[PDB]
């Protein structure tokens, strides 16, 4: 029977002859009995009761480390976990009909708009938010300007050493960062001084003057870009972060601004915003490179040739749609054009027999989920926060937000003092890592390892800090928090099968899109070497 054991059942299994019932044991039985009388309570209340039961059980095992009932109580703890999943699957509430996209730090491009429009076209019953920051359209411009200039400065120092094997990609990225870090410090010191002098100044005011003073950019041209950026986003369901009061007043806002203003990491700032948006409003978050799910039975008459993978086939399906329906102009066909004419004709025939977009892409419709959960997309590498589904104020959305805040607290506790010493990049790194390592233990070891690379994020190969800070790891940790009836998990022991309990159905997203499959590029050593080599070729052309 799937239902959680009752008091009498627990008494039997946790029975030890000749042992009196301790106060700590009775407490468990009492709470278990209370749980079974809670049929009229809310899901969250039921969960909190289960949490209390687990806590009381842990207190017993810790108090009487030798007790004969520990074996049975450990089995009981397993039953509690199963009950959480049962509670999750059996009590569903409607998901608010909102689609959330995020595009901050610069002008939204046409490709993003075209993808978003696909969702709009088949989900007319959904409100669409494309979150942007009206104060910070120039952050990407700033980063690109600083980085490009730094690349060019660095390569000039390589001029007489191009055949020297010591002047490798490693040296390049190291030397480049010395310059980038110095500029980042210069900028943030300027930002802080400007804010002190005139608190009415917004990010873009300070950035544009900085760009004019430091890199001879024209304020007039930057003003035009801001205007064009604002107009483009507001005409495409723009939702300004600067009007998101709950976000601005919460404990995540300073983390958002840390990433936006100090680190110029738009991906990380997006990570922080998206889950706060989902928590506060409810609905479905999507990356702008996701497309609506294909109708399940659309291509059932076409079977896959043996000379191609599932990933090749999935990409081909979308490319066929875009070739013959032209929903997105300029969509690739490189995978479709590799097929035999017999199957290309098979695609053309199927799609010709279809009239409306609603016959090709499915609609999200009435969705429901547990008040406990956030659902997440999966790819071949595991969970990925490119797709999220949650009811407003779901327990897990709260757990995820808290995971991210706690991770940043650990980071900033060591990072801020390190930075404040006002040394160069390498010295700051060493100070920071030494500080982080002093707080490392068996529980947080792998996490702390990645944290130590924070300042390298986006500028060096083999850096996974973001996923550990604001990305998938924080989500896995929240799921562990839920299933282990705790908060602040650092050591992820959950595996795929555990996480699949929270998966978004494959029918609800097309993940194998042109934009996505191009962004599965991983910045590893090989990629870094190739990038260095491309930079050198461009830079030294002529002689």
């Amino acid at each position, epitope marked *: 029977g799937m239902s959680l054991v009752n008091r009498k059942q627990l008494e039997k299994m946790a029975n030890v002859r000749f042992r009196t019932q301790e106060d700590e044991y009775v407490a468990i039985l009492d709470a278990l009995e209370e749980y079974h009388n809670m049929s009229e309570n809310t899901v969250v209340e039921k969960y909190l009761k289960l949490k209390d039961i687990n806590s009381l059980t842990d207190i017993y095992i810790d108090t009487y480390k030798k007790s004969g009932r520990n074996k049975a109580l450990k089995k009981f703890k397993e039953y509690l976990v199963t009950e959480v999943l049962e509670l999750k699957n059996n009590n569903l509430t409607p998901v608010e009909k909102n689609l959330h996209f995020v595009w901050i730090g610069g002008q939204i491009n046409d490709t993003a708009i075209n993808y978003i429009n696909q969702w709009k076209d088949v989900n007319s019953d959904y409100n669409v938010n494309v979150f942007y920051d009206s104060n910070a359209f120039l952050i990407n411009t700033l980063k690109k*300007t600083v980085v*490009e*200039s*730094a*690349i*060019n*400065d660095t*390569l*000039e*120092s390589f*001029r007489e050493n191009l055949n020297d094997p010591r002047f490798d990609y490693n040296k390049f990225f190291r030397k480049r960062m010395e*310059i980038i870090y110095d500029k980042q410090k210069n900028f943030i010191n300027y930002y802080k001084a400007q804010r002190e002098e005139n608190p009415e100044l917004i990010i873009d005011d300070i950035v544009k003057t900085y760009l004019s003073n430091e*890199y*001879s*950019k024209e304020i007039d041209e930057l003003n035009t870009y801001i205007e064009e950026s604002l107009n483009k986003i507001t005409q495409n369901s723009g939702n300004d972060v600067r009007n998101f009061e709950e976000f601005k007043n919460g404990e995540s806002f300073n983390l958002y601004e840390q990433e936006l203003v100090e680190r110029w990491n738009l991906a990380a700032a997006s990570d922080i915003l998206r889950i706060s948006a989902l928590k506060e409003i409810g609905g479905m978050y999507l990356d702008v490179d996701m497309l609506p799910g294909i109708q399940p039975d659309l291509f059932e008459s076409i079977e896959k040739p043996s000379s191609v993978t599932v990933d090749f086939w999935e990409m081909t399906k979308l490319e066929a749609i875009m070739k013959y329906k032209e929903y997105i102009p300029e969509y690739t066909s490189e995978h479709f054009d590799m097929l035999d004419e017999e199957v290309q004709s098979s695609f053309e025939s199927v799609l010709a027999s279809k009239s409306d977009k609603s016959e090709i892409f499915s609609s999200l419709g009435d969705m429901e989920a547990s008040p406990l959960e956030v659902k997440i997309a999966f790819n071949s590498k595991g969970i990925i926060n490119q797709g999220l589904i949650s009811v407003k104020d779901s327990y897990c959305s709260n757990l995820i937000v808290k995971q991210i805040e706690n991770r940043y607290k650990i980071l900033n506790n060591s990072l801020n003092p390190a930075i404040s010493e006002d040394n160069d990049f390498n010295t700051t790194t060493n100070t920071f890592i030494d500080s982080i390592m002093a707080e490392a233990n068996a529980d947080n070891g792998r996490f702390m390892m990645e944290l130590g690379k924070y300042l390298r994020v986006g500028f060096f190969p083999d850096v996974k800090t973001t996923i550990n800070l604001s990305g998938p790891e924080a989500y896995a940790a929240a799921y562990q928090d839920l299933l282990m009836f705790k908060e602040g998990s650092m050591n992820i022991h959950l595996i795929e099968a555990d996480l699949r309990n929270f998966e978004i159905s494959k029918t609800n997203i097309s993940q194998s899109t042109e934009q996505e499959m191009a962004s599965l590029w991983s910045f590893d050593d090989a990629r870094a070497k190739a990038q260095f080599e*491309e*930079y*050198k070729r*461009n*830079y*030294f*052309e*002529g*002689s």
Partner: nanobody, 119 residues
Framework: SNSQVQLVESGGGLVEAGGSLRLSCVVTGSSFSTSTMAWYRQPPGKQREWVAS???????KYTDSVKGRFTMSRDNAKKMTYLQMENLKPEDTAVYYCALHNAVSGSSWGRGTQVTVSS
């Protein structure tokens, strides 16, 4: 190479040994302020050689044979670079070219300006 960037060098000619000469280069396009500017020269019979560079970060370098004699400058507002040559020697005779170097948007070169030093 970046086709949207053009460079026009000027100021070359015939000059006496020990004399001074200033070359100029005007640059078009929008990459000047984030690029490195460089001067080169191709002496008769020999391959083109590097002379001087001035990075967008403000670093100046010179080839050894020219140190103490040549002065390179750059002006982001005017999008111009200059090579001031002093105490000119016969071995300085060459076609002098200017280049904008950019790893991101690409590099562009001028067609050069000839300098002949008498002796």
């Amino acid at each position: 190479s970046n086709s949207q960037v053009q460079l026009v060098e000027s100021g070359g000619g015939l000059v006496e040994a020990g004399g001074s000469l200033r070359l100029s280069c005007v640059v078009t396009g929008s990459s000047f302020s984030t690029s490195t500017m460089a001067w080169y020269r191709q002496p008769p019979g020999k391959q083109r050689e590097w002379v001087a560079s001035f990075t967008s970060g403000g670093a100046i370098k010179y080839t050894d044979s020219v140190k103490g004699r040549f002065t390179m400058s750059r002006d982001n507002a005017k999008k111009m670079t200059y090579l001031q040559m002093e105490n000119l020697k016969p071995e300085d005779t060459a076609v002098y070219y200017c280049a904008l170097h950019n790893a991101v948007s690409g590099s562009s070169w001028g067609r050069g300006t000839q300098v002949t030093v008498s002796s």
